[PDB]
């Protein structure tokens, strides 16, 4: 029973993370016909050809001066000096006419992605956020509608149907002819993903006794980490998104063969405070956790090693979260871990000449600090709250994180245009303010 649930968790792990590998943007520039003929005629500087063709984009303007513009010089059927063709033609190179890009650009990568295939650069750059937005919309919509399908059919036919739909959707998306169909299949599988993922957790929690809930939760975390580790290995040997999608989709097809009421928390004034503080903390932590990975997977010079190292530091977080129990109070680790995720974000915007040996350790520290805080909320939930109230609170928090994940990607991706450090100020503010609301949790007049 444990093996099946762990395999299911590991298989669900790449669904919300693979956008780092499936959709990635490489360096590109506008292409002009006839430049190849001159390059064949004159091969003095194949490398400097770019230098001799791409315009001189200035600081902070390279996003809309070399990737979305081209020169109007007629290279073909023109006599050149083979060294500086532009200098001889015109004394000043800042006065020639420009124009919109054409012919689908030219990329520099041995692999392929959705950006490379469908040309999602320049004015269409906002189409990449739809990928995550549709999946999160599916996550939100599938949470409410899963209860009805648990009745009038049974608790057995749902899992098989969800697994079959997920596998078929994955394969068909791997065989998609146009852009709209891929979005449709993403939305279609977004429901069944969480629909089948929640059942494994519920079964694992129910089957094991109350004395090993912590152990099985740690086992689930270890399974998630292992599933995250194996995905980095596959993307190393399969540099095409169709191959990678098929390779991560086929195993799903292969392996298939006087009562606690929710209205009592808002009447007594003592239980109306912590039940709001915990909700706010959970929402903030989920938003931060979702944002950090997407920020990291966009400005990395070494993606594989950074991903592996960041994923390898999530076991000590659980170890310390378990060790701190029964020895220290419940708010000191919470405050410290919430404060550790803000200082790192604040520092991460002030180290220009220290790259390649500091960003990795700072990102690891921030990731561990975020991971520690999430476990404490779950432990407090399991300690202080009854069954039914938490049985609805899990769905409520899932809906909260789903709406947070709907709103996040647009803000994260489209706020980097004004300045590259803007998304790293909101994270610092949220982290540094979430550590000041936990100090209102202790009850006043606590007699020793």
């Amino acid at each position: 029973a444990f093996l099946i649930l762990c395999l299911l968790s590991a298989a669900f792990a790449p669904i919300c993370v693979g956008i780092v590998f499936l959709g990635f943007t490489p360096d590109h520039h506008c292409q002009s016909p006839g430049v190849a003929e001159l390059s064949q005629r004159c091969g003095w500087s194949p490398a400097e050809e770019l230098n001799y063709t791409v315009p001189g984009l200035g600081p902070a303007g390279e996003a809309f001066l070399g990737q979305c513009r081209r020169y109007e010089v007629d290279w073909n059927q023109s006599a050149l000096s083979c060294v500086d063709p532009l200098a001889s033609l015109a004394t000043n190179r800042s006065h020639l006419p420009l124009g919109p890009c054409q012919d689908g650009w030219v990329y520099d990568t041995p692999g392929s992605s959705i950006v490379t295939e469908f040309n999602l650069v320049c004015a269409d750059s906002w189409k990449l956020d739809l990928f995550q937005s549709c999946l999160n919309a599916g996550f939100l919509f599938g949470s409410l509608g899963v209860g009805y399908f648990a009745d009038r059919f049974g608790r057995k036919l749902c899992l098989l149907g969800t697994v079959l739909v997920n596998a078929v959707s994955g394969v068909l998306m791997a065989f998609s002819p146009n852009y709209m169909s891929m979005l449709l299949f993403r939305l279609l599988q977004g429901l069944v993903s969480k629909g089948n993922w929640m059942a494994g957790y519920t079964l694992i929690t129910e089957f094991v006794g109350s004395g090993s809930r912590r152990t099985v939760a740690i086992m689930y975390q270890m399974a998630f980490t292992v599933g995250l580790v194996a995905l980095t290995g596959l993307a190393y040997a399969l540099p095409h998104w169709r191959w990678l999608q098929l390779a991560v989709s086929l195993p799903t097809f292969l392996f298939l063969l006087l009562s606690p009421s929710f209205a009592d928390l808002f009447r007594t004034p003592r239980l109306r405070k912590r039940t709001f503080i915990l909700m706010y903390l959970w929402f903030t932590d989920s938003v931060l956790y979702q944002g950090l990975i997407l920020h990291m997977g966009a400005t990395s010079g070494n993606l594989y090693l950074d991903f592996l190292y960041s994923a390898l530091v999530e076991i000590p977080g659980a170890f310390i979260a378990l060790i701190t129990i029964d020895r220290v109070g419940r708010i000191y680790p919470m405050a410290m871990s919430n404060l550790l995720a803000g200082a790192a974000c604040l520092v991460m915007i002030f180290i220009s000449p220290d790259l390649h040996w500091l960003n990795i350790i700072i990102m690891c520290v921030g990731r561990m600090g975020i991971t520690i805080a999430i476990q404490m909320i779950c432990l407090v939930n399991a300690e202080l709250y009854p069954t039914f109230v938490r049985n609805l609170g899990v769905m409520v928090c899932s809906s909260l994180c789903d709406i947070g994940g709907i709103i996040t990607p647009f803000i994260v991706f489209r706020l980097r245009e004004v300045w590259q450090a803007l998304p790293l100020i909101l994270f610092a503010v949220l982290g540094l303010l979430a550590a000041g609301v936990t100090l209102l949790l202790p009850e006043t007049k606590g007699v020793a």
Epitope: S210, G211, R213, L258, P260, D264, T268, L271, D326, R327, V328, G329, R330, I331, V380, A382, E383, L384, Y385, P386, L441, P442, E443, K445, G446, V447, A448
Partner: nanobody, 118 residues
Framework: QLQESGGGLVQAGGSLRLSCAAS????????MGWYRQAPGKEREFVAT???????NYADSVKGRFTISRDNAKNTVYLQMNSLKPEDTAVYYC????????????????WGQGTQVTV
């Protein structure tokens, strides 16, 4: 409102049972426990229990005391057997504070307890 029961005068440290009652709001949303007067000492700790069912114990009474929870009658039970002529104190029912201190050091509710001697 916390109220206790049980108690008596055992002859040679025999088995005895203690019961603590709750109101209904306390019984479902926080953590209960038991504390010992221990004359000559300010306060002593014995055992706890929470919603999940995980239990703690004191290093001096480990393997002799058992705590169980009853949901029908809204009560928390404690069973002591094979006592020794060293446990003569007053037993209180209390609700500790988790967020501040060490998790069992501070109290916000108590019910004046009861006295049992051996």
């Amino acid at each position: 409102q916390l109220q206790e029961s049980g108690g008596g005068l055992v002859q040679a440290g025999g088995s005895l049972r203690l019961s603590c009652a709750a109101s209904g709001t306390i019984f479902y949303y926080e953590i209960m426990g038991w504390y010992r007067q221990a004359p000559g000492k300010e306060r002593e700790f014995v055992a706890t229990i929470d919603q999940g069912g995980i239990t703690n114990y004191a290093d001096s009474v480990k393997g002799r005391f058992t705590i169980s929870r009853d949901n029908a009658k809204n009560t928390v039970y404690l069973q002591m057997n094979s006592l020794k002529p060293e446990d003569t104190a007053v037993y209180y029912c209390a609700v500790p504070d988790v967020f501040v201190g060490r998790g069992w050091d501070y109290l916000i509710y108590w019910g004046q307890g009861t006295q049992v001697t051996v």
